[PDB]
Amino acid sequence: QNTPWSSTELADAFINAFMNEAGRTGAFTADQLDDMSTIGDTIKTAMDKMARSNKSSKGKLQALNMAFASSMAEIAAVEQGGLSVDAKTNAIADSLNSAFYQTTGAANPQFVNEIRSLINMFAQSS
Amino acid sequence: QNTPWSSTELADAFINAFMNEAGRTGAFTADQLDDMSTIGDTIKTAMDKMARSNKSSKGKLQALNMAFASSMAEIAAGLSVDAKTNAIADSLNSAFYQTTGAANPQFVNEIRSLINMFA
């Protein structure tokens, strides 16, 4: 029903809202933000192609959105520079929540807590 | 050199190796393989352009590799989940072997863990 992946426009809106908020947190280096932007742009491109094949779905956009967030988690956990992993984790979580609010009018604590766990998981292997 | 995100050619090789092995497992539907192929093609193209425009980096290749691996897993997520997950794992191992000369059980275990969290 009320998800960021109900359409390509809202899915784009989610990624763009996240990118804007990530930058405003100040928790990430310029290079880290550039890397996030690259992932976001690539995911949006994929979403656009699937939309055009007319075999797209909320589920497929949802999967690409999870891939986007998983990449964000990896950038936060792996790339060095800027603040601590704990600060980065809070920044990713807040930036995701902002994206959920701007596209759905509500938070998504289940999704965000999953990304929190994912960051910790990636952080272990370093 | 030694990892799939060491260079653009190795990152492409990883994605192409994965797609070929994914098809050979027989665990995925034609539509699933098509979507995987589209996402793979999109990422490779982005990387190829980045290399030539001098906007590439290790950070972007490693993150794009995670976007790919997480996409392949989630696109897959019909048949049983464990069978699909094992197919995703076999495809990852084959891709690591063909690009780095060895498997990467650590990476695969992370992907397994990633699948469990989202499910």
Entry resolution (Å): 2.0
Backbone angles phi, psi at A55, to 5 degrees: -130, 20
Side chain identity at A114, as an amino acid letter?
E
Subunit contact B70:A75, Cβ cutoff 8 A:
no
Closest CA to A19 of A68, A84, A63, A90: A68
Task: Give the chain A residue whose CA is nearest to the CA of B117.
Answer: A114
The minimum CA-CA distance between A100 and chain B, rounded to whole Å, is 17
Option in B62, B63, B74 nearest A63 (CB): B74
With contact defined as beta carbons under 8 Å apart, do A11 and A47 qualify?
A: yes
With contact defined as beta carbons under 8 Å apart, do A100 and A111 qualify?
A: yes
Greatest pairwise CA separation for chain B in angstroms: 43
Domain membership of residue B58 (yes or no) is yes
SS3 state of residue A71: helix
Write out chain A residues lying below 8 Å of B68, CB-based.
67
Structure-solving method: X-ray
The rounded radius of gyration (Å) of the Cα atoms in chain B is 14
Backbone angles phi, psi at B55, to 5 degrees: -125, 20
Domain membership of residue A126 (yes or no) is yes
**What value, to the nearest 5°, has the Cα angle with vertex B111 and ends A37 and B85?**
125
Option in A34, A39, A64 nearest B64 (CB): A39
Domain membership of residue A28 (yes or no) is yes
Q: Please enumerate residues of A whose Cβ is less than 8 A from a Cβ of B.
A: 31-32, 34-36, 38-39, 41-43, 45-46, 49-50, 53, 55, 60, 62-64, 66-68, 70-71, 74-75, 78-79, 114, 117-118, 121-122, 125
The string of DSSP codes covering A80-98 is: -SSS-HHHHHHHHHHHHHH
Subunit contact A31:B57, Cβ cutoff 8 A:
yes
Overall domain count for chain A:
1
Domain membership of residue A1 (yes or no) is no
Domain membership of residue B72 (yes or no) is yes
Domain that holds residue B47: 8-119
Subunit contact B70:A66, Cβ cutoff 8 A:
yes
How many helices, marked H, and strands, marked E, lie in chain A?
A: 5, 0
Write out chain B residues lying below 8 Å of A114, CB-based.
117-118
Task: Give the chain A residue whose CA is nearest to the CA of B77.
Answer: A63
Report residue B107 CA to chain centroid gap.
Answer: 11
* Domain containing residue B99: CATH number: 1.10.274.70
Burial state string for A73-109 with b = 16 or more CB within 10 A and e = fewer than 16: bbbbbbbeebbebeebbebbbbbbbbbbebbbeeebe
Say how many Å lie between the first and final Cα of chain A, rounded.
Answer: 38
Domain membership of residue A2 (yes or no) is no
The C-alpha atoms of residue A96 and residue B54 are separated, in whole angstroms, by 30
Structure tokens at A50: 């699937």
Burial state string for A12-23 with b = 16 or more CB within 10 A and e = fewer than 16: bbbbbbbbebbe
Write out chain B residues lying below 8 Å of A63, CB-based.
71, 74-75, 77
The C-alpha atoms of residue B53 and residue B55 are separated, in whole angstroms, by 6
Write out chain B residues lying below 8 Å of A31, CB-based.
57, 59
The C-alpha atoms of residue A23 and residue A27 are separated, in whole angstroms, by 8
Crossing angle of helices B8-25/B81-100, nearest 10°?
A: 140
Side chain identity at B49, as an amino acid letter?
K
Domain membership of residue B2 (yes or no) is no
